[PDB]
Amino acid sequence: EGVLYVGSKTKEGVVHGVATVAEKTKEQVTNVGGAVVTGVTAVAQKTVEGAGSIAAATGFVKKD
Amino acid sequence: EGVLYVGSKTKEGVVHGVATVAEKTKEQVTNVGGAVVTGVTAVAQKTVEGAGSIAAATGFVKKD
Amino acid sequence: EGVLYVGSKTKEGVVHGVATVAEKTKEQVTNVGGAVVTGVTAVAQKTVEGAGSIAAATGFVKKD
Amino acid sequence: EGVLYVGSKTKEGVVHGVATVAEKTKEQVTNVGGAVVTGVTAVAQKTVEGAGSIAAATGFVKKD
Amino acid sequence: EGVLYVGSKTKEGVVHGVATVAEKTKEQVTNVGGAVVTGVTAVAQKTVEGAGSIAAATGFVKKD
Amino acid sequence: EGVLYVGSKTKEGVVHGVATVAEKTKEQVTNVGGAVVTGVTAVAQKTVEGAGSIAAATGFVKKD
Amino acid sequence: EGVLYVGSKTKEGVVHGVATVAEKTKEQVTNVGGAVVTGVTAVAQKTVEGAGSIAAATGFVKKD
Amino acid sequence: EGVLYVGSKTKEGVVHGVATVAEKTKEQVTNVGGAVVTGVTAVAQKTVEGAGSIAAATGFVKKD
Amino acid sequence: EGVLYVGSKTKEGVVHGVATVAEKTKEQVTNVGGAVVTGVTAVAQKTVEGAGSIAAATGFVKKD
Amino acid sequence: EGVLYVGSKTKEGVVHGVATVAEKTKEQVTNVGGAVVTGVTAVAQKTVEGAGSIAAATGFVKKD
Ligand SMILES: [Cl-]
Ligand SMILES: [Cl-]
Ligand SMILES: [Cl-]
Ligand SMILES: [Cl-]
Ligand SMILES: [Cl-]
Ligand SMILES: [Cl-]
Ligand SMILES: [Cl-]
Ligand SMILES: [Cl-]
Ligand SMILES: [Cl-]
Ligand SMILES: [Cl-]
């Protein structure tokens, strides 16, 4: 069964993850369906184990 | 059964995770469905074990 | 059954997690469905074990 | 049954977790569905064991 | 069963992940269906194990 | 009249001064005419003010 | 009159000064006429003010 | 009158000054007439002010 | 009157000064008339102010 | 009156100064009349101010 070995060496790391910036705007969205993982070493793992599973990411919905 | 081995060495790390910045704006969103994990070493693991599971991330909804 | 081994060495770490900043704005949201984990070493683990489970993250909803 | 081994060595760590900052704004939200964990070593673990479980994080709702 | 071995050595890394920037705009979206993983070493793994699974990423929907 | 301004800032310093090491040897010498100054900040100042002054450093002398 | 301004900033320094090492040898010398100054910041100043001054450094002398 | 301004910034420095190493040898010399200054920042200044001054560095002398 | 301004910035420096190494040899010399200055920043200044001054560096002398 | 301005920027420097190496040899010399200055930034200045000054560097002398 699967192995997610991650091995990392660095002397320096500078990391900027997600920046959302707005001036004088309307209706700005940064929808993320999964995790937001930010690191010198960064690992995201997701397992969905079943039938009929739904993953549904939407920025915005406007009905009338 | 699966192994998420993460091994990390660094001398320095500088990490900025999620920044959401607004001036004079309306309706600004940073919806995240999973975790927000921020680190020199950063790991997010999610397991969903079942049938018919729903993951549904939406920034915003406007009905009438 | 799964192993989440995380091994970390660092001499220095500077970490900034989630910043939400607003001036003169309206309706600003940073909805996070999971945990917010911020660390020199940062680990988030979530297990959902069942059928029909729902994960539903939404920034905002406006009905009439 | 699963093992969340976390091993950490650091000489220095500086960590800033969640900042929510507002000036002259209205309706600013930092909804977090899980824990907020902030540490030089930071670990969040959540287990939900059952069928039909709901996780539902929403910034704000406005009906009429 | 599959192995996702990642091995990394670097002396320096500077990483900027996702930037969404808006001025005087309306209706700006950066919908991401999976994780957002940002790192000097960055790994995202997703496994969906079942029949009839849906992955559905949409920027925005407007009905009337 | 002269100014020996020394200004130093360091976060870490490791300093090894004078090592003299011998195994199974004969007649090993580390003659130093001035001071031996060893420090994270190290300053040696010597002033000789007169006529006919002698400075004479010799490791060893063997007459018959 | 003269100014010996020394201004130093460092984050790390590792310094090894004078090593004299011998195995199974004879008659090994490290004669130094002035100071031995070893430091992350290291300054040696010598002033000789007079006529007919002698500086005479010799490793070894053997007459008969 | 003269100015010996030295200004230094470094993040890291590793410095090895004078090594004299001998195995199974005879009559090995490292005569130095002035100072031995070893540093991340290293300054040696010598002033001799007079007539007829002698500086005389010799490794070794053998008369009969 | 003269100015010896030295201005230095470096991120890393590795410096090895004077190495004298001998195996199974005889009569090995590293005579240096002035200072030995070893540094990430290294400055040697010598002023001799007078008439008839002698600087005389000799490795070795053998009379009969 | 003269100005010896030295201005240096480097990201990395590796410097090896003077190496004298001998195996099974006799009478090996590295006579240096002035200073030995070794650095990422290295400056040697010598001023001799007078009439009839002698600078005399000799490896070795053998009379009978
Ligand atoms: Cl960021
Ligand atoms: Cl941030
Ligand atoms: Cl923050
Ligand atoms: Cl904070
Ligand atoms: Cl970014
Ligand atoms: Cl020592
Ligand atoms: Cl040493
Ligand atoms: Cl050394
Ligand atoms: Cl050396
Ligand atoms: Cl060398």
Curated annotation (Swiss-Prot), chains A, B, C, D, E, F, G, H, I, J:
**PTM comment for this protein?**
Phosphorylated, predominantly on serine residues. Phosphorylation by CK1 appears to occur on residues distinct from the residue phosphorylated by other kinases. Hallmark lesions of neurodegenerative synucleinopathies contain alpha-synuclein that is modified by nitration of tyrosine residues and possibly by dityrosine cross-linking to generated stable oligomers.
What happens after mutating H16A? Impairs copper-binding
Q: Which compartment or compartments is the protein found in?
A: Cytoplasm; Membrane; Nucleus; Synapse
Which sections of the protein are sequence repeats? 1-7, 8-22, 23-33
UniProt entry tagged with the keyword Acetylation: yes
Q: Which UniProt keywords apply?
A: Acetylation, Alzheimer disease, Amyloid, Cell projection, Copper, Cytoplasm, Disease variant, Membrane, Metal-binding, Neurodegeneration, Nucleus, Parkinson disease, Parkinsonism, Phosphoprotein, Repeat, Secreted, Synapse, Ubl conjugation
Residues bearing Phosphoserine?
A: S53
The record comments on the domains as follows: The 'non A-beta component of Alzheimer disease amyloid plaque' domain (NAC domain) is involved in fibrils formation. The middle hydrophobic region forms the core of the filaments. The C-terminus may regulate aggregation and determine the diameter of the filaments.
Protein name in the entry: Alpha-synuclein
Its taxonomic path starts at:
Eukaryota, Metazoa, Chordata, Craniata, Vertebrata
Boundaries of the shown chain within the full protein: 35 to 98 of 140
